[PDB]
Amino acid sequence: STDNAETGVIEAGNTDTDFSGELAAPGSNHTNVKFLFDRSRLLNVIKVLEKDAVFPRPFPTQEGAQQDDGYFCLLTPRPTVASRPATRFGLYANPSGSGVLANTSLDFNFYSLACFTYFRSDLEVTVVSLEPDLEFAVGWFPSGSEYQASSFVYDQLHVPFHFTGRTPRAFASKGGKVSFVLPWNSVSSVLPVRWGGASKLSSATRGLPAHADWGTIYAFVPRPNEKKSTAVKHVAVYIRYKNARAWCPSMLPFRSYK
Amino acid sequence: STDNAETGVIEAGNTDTDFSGELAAPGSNHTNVKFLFDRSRLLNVIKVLEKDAVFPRPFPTQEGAQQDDGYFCLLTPRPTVASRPATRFGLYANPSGSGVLANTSLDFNFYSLACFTYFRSDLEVTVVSLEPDLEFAVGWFPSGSEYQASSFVYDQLHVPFHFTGRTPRAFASKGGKVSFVLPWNSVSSVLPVRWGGASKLSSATRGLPAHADWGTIYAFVPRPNEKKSTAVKHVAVYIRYKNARAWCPSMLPFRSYK
Amino acid sequence: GPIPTAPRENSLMFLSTLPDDTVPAYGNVRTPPVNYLPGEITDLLQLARIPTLMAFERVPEPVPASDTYVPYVAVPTQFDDRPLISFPITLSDPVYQNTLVGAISSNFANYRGCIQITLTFCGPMMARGKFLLSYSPPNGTQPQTLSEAMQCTYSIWDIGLNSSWTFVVPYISPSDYRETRAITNSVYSADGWFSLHKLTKITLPPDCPQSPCILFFASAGEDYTLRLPVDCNPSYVF
Amino acid sequence: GPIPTAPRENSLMFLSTLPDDTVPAYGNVRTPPVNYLPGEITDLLQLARIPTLMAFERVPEPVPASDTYVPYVAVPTQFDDRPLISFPITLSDPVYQNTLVGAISSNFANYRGCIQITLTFCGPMMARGKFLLSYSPPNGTQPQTLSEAMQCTYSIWDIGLNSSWTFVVPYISPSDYRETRAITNSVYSADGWFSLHKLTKITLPPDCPQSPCILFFASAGEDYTLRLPVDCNPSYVF
Amino acid sequence: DRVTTQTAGNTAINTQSSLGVLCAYVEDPTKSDPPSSSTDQPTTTFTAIDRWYTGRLNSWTKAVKTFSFQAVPLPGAFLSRQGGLNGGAFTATLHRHFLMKCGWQVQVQCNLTQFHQGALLVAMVPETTLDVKPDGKAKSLQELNEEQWVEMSDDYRTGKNMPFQSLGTYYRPPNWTWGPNFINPYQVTVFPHQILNARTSTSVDINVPYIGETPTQSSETQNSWTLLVMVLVPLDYKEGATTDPEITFSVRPTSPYFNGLRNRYTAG
Amino acid sequence: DRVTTQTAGNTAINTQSSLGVLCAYVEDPTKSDPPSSSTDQPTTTFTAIDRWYTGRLNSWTKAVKTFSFQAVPLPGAFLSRQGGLNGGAFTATLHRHFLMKCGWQVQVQCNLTQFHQGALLVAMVPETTLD
Amino acid sequence: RGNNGNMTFNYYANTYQNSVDFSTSGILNPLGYLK
Amino acid sequence: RGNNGNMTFNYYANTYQNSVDFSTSGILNPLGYLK
């Protein structure tokens, strides 16, 4: 039917608008935002700590630095690099060379349907072992907080301070899993799926949000430093969005024709 | 008593119709359709994935193809062959020769009592390990959907995309089982026990329905590709029909007198 | 706080016939309506009541086509004081194998109630004759003679305008239920015999085909019931 | 005392889509209010209804800039009895790839309802002309001729004061839902074709550019619905 | 009573030995609503298609064996003109629509004599592929004429010979042993039917409603109902009696709904 | 006003310069009764034939002289497919009936420009043999 | 009902435990009628 | 609601199971209006 798309508004019609027919009855409400994002998906795979760690230093990190890489998981669907917020998402097509291969993550599913600018929800976290008969624990600190390093000595054994604290620590049974829900805890009101600002007035990276996350989790072995092993253990981190809400329509990623 | 069967209608009589006696009181309602099909039975036995797979290609498949066979289970009482819908049911009397032995399935019990043309119900799926102390997970995608291949790299480990997604993934405990119910999800209204149509206007196979199923399930190990094993593991898939309904009286399989 | 519990000995058990549901994995799904579809079946007895054809080995004189089983009995012209045909009232007997009653019944352990045998005369309309259908409960020896059949439950059928005759086999048993399959022969799984005798030979006018045929059907009577679902016999696929 | 329990076979199972909550680990948290934020989205259909541009390979004559896909169709001056452009009503087809309807729909298994194609004439205002838009349900052969298109669902669009024309593709299907992705080609995943024919050639006055362009948009009709969330295709990151 | 005349449009079929009309599933298989799966206004019954179409089947002879049969696919027979079944305006409309939903009223005619004997089972069978050869191709008019009647065999009783997709050289060809489209000859009376017994009538009538796995179906490929004529008792008579009695049938589409109008169907 | 869209079945024709529809003889040329000369129940309109069929005519050039013309017989044009006028189900029904009674709604399309000049007379003429 | 002996409680809502048709808005009957 | 079929019971209080904003004290609407 006659219209003018230049207006910026085009009404959705049906078979009977210009032709002869009727409306098809509604088949489902699966496009409902709350229902759609309310399901677990893989966020990242991290190594399990077997001693107190040294949190990765800020960028740019110079050669010779002593730190633990691939252990901390930033809870966010946004791109991350080496446990920190990121803008560009990267991977390694040529894993051959010199230098540490930074861990990167991205909620692929989230962005394939994130046709909006802002998002908010509580976060259900599930940690699954990728190792046989593993006994591990999970640690977590809020957005804006940090990992408490070092350790204390009990009976000449070094026990990392990450065994204690005021934040959630979940000890799984041998071969078991860990699961719990966290509240939106960032100081921001909503999470910017895409962002155009800057978190600092000087030497800031445009588009890089400072606290677009639900905090950080890590996994460790309920054993003292001394009883350390040599074989690196891995654990998978799953997240689920509870009571999700979204604002300001936006685009979905470009699909190549090649 | 006097009648005419040519009519197409013959009334069910009792002892007192022509003789002397009474009606026998009802002993049970076990022939009730909903009650009868509401029990688990073996559907298929599949291999457990230990890496991202390559779903079997459509027929006719030519020699030299690279794919994973015997891993995907089409949820249907109808005959299946190599994870796809089928018409004729086959087996291998002479397992000796060249070529891949296609996996085939059939709900033997269902067809022995499927004296009707159409059927519908929800489906309760139970996956049982046929291996000692096995830790596995189950994946599933809806009728009309497909397996998401490939993988992503985390800490230089390849993790299949079948570890994530928006569809059900059930991780069993070590030595445990998996169980859940799925809704009738095909685009068709009912499942044709026997069918006389064609799903395409050209080069179609008469009698072969396109979506007479509740989707497809597969099993995999919650381990990265690198920690792959050499011994193939098997898992048994059981199904149960919930709230079953049936339409249009039909025949039961022919029983040989030989 | 936590509720104290005491999980039982059968915890974690998977029971294939447990009368309960399990957790939903992909809910909130609406399905296309099925109101447009007629012919819904609520109980398989609705089908067991529909008479279907029985099967008999064609009298030692088969056709060049292997597996010569026929749904009828040709009425021979020669007199003989024994049944034209007879079969046991044992649901697992081959004569019921491919009837719906028999096929459906073979999937349950017990039955209770009447079985119905329906006969349809398919000879020419000019034909006349009478038959004696009888049912004998178990005896040490199976009856053969007209004089013996006549002492059991029986009815005389006259050939004429109406083509068919229904014969209800009474449910005469010591037990309230009977075995559907005669794994072991006993008074609980074998209930005697049904037999058909020609009472007065068939009479035909000149220039009429000889040996008219009688079609046999079997079905569940109105008070017929099946109990205890059992495992199926998958051999139909071999 | 202790309550006797019987944990089921699927105890300890982790189901990614379980329709239930899990235990809170850090509760009693109040969050900054979001009342100040406008533009809240409740359902993704709200976005699928917003028309977005389609994409066509620029007629075998690309620009030195790789990946030459355009959101419009230039109207050639030469007469030819075949469609100016045509594409299947298969949601997984590349022409819908980057439209919101297509992108969003590709993340579900089924759809039901109408798709809407919107055309906007971007030639000069002095131009005149007429077009015939048609939709053909599946056929053995795709229609090409004006005579064939004219026998299907179609509308004639006149160029004039108003610049656009919306065309609703009726939902004509054997099933109540259709496949969103044509993994296998069938009557349930491919529903025919949409085509655009120039009815009467475009007429222009002297000193007017030739080959005016027509912008193409696609969106969900008002009765459009999506069912069954499926796994995403992560390739956009490679 | 036994004398009836059924009118439809400019058509009327009479019989003087009616057994009544066997109605399948519901008392009035004619009641039907538009398909919920199409939003376009459907084309419904008009007088030029509200009528009986009549065609032929192969004659019945003494040589036809028990359980041998003939099948008439619906609406397939209209599309191929099997038995000379030209559907006039019905076929013309069918060829121009993607979808079609309808029921059927059928009468099979075959007169014998009070001196002949034999019986034919006439049924309306849902969802069969009895009109297709094992290689997947539909039997041509010539092939139907060469065989006359299809003999019951292990293949048909088993479904072993139904159409199928060849797997390809990548797979070891399996031993096909069974198919869901089998035919258990002893249970064909489970379907809506009547028996044409030489001694009782010269015709049978069956009335069935629309059925299908979906609200409506593809015009060109559906085959939800198949008219089946099968020998139960071999034909017999004495020398002098008329031989090879003929068989004809009349079909009437009921409450049709056509959706998705387009140019005439053209094979791809 | 000048912008109209006429729907019929699965058909719709638009124009942005309508002059209105010229109705001949009566306000609603659509009202009509069955023929009194046939006792058989007639076949009347069904949705597959309640629509617009579109075809072509030869182009207009500077060389065409005053009073030169083109004619489209009705229903003749449907029978011969003049201008590619295939009547789908309408023709199929027409070919299967001895008698047919009906009216017609027609639209002739020909766009020019504000810089062109010329005029065509478009009429519906009763009982001619111009074809 | 079906093969279900749970009279007591239903933890999950009907629309989650089962699928239900969307809207378009003892006594065993015969499957055949002679008319 | 979301992907939740639990109609029955909620063991943990709303303020613990979820986060709630602190105070400062069907029908799908359009995201654009032409005025």
Ligand SMILES: [Ca+2]
């Ligand atoms: Ca417990």
